[PDB]
């Protein structure tokens, strides 16, 4: 039920305002199709050497940097941009915030 | 509040939760292309008159009813869904809330 609306210059890099509290841990995902039954694809944990039959790639450099989290300012197409927030490093209790973009 | 996140079953009718305070006046818009520099197109205008210069009518199935405002649960392609909330009937002091959908 929590939503973060942010404005950025379309087609240019955008350092996202992380909506989690500043001392909370944050993990970034795409919820495929913005559907709750669909997978949460974790964004900034890419280890090479996957042999999975399903692999996610970044043709257009949607994710520009992981530190700090920076995206190309563009309409989400695979699904919704979602950050998961926790006081605990192990994410024992967490809340998810969707990040929505208005274009300047 | 700038962002309202709501859940509905995709392609089924959905009565949109008005995120404005219950005693506030509210008008529904599409913001073309989700761009701040684009026009707001007012939805569900009853009749052209002193309060509404132009009646906009969708040619497809996005709007199910205008009383109460009911959509076919989907994200709009023309732009973002925005509600303008005002304590006053003249809409001189107001705030806009963007409505976005998670799909069941
Ligand atoms: Ca922040
Ligand atoms: Ca943070
Ligand atoms: Ca309400
Ligand atoms: Ca209302």
Numbering used by the authors:
A (entry chain A), B (entry chain B): 18 to 121
Provide excerpts from the study.
ORF8 is a viral immunoglobulin-like (Ig-like) domain protein encoded by the severe acute respiratory syndrome coronavirus 2 (SARS-CoV-2) RNA genome. The full-length SARS-CoV-2 ORF8 is composed of a signal peptide (residues 1-15) and an Ig-like domain (residues 16-121). Herein, we determined the crystal structures of SARS-CoV-2 ORF8 (S84) (one of the epidemic isoforms) and the bat coronavirus RaTG13 ORF8 variant at 1.62 Å and 1.76 Å resolution, respectively.
To determine the sequence-structure relationship, we next solved the crystal structure of the RaTG13 ORF8 Ig-like domain at 1.76 Å, in which the electron density of residues 18-121 can be clearly traced. It is worth noting that there are two molecules in one asymmetric unit, which is different from SARS-CoV-2 ORF8 (S84). Protomers A and B form a dimer via an intermolecular covalent Cys20-Cys20 disulfide bond. Similar to SARS-CoV-2 ORF8, the RaTG13 ORF8 Ig-like domain folds into a “β-sandwich” containing two β-sheets (strands βB, βD, and βE compose the small sheet; strands βA, βC, βC’, βF, and βG compose the large sheet) and an insertion region. Unlike SARS-CoV-2 ORF8 (S84), the residues 62-78 loop region of RaTG13 ORF8 is assembled different conformations between the protomer A and protomer B in one asymmetric unit. The electron density of residues 63-65 of RaTG13 ORF8 is unclear, indicating a dynamic region. SARS-CoV-2 ORF8 (L84) was the strongest, followed by SARS-CoV-2 ORF8 (S84), and RaTG13 ORF8 was the last.
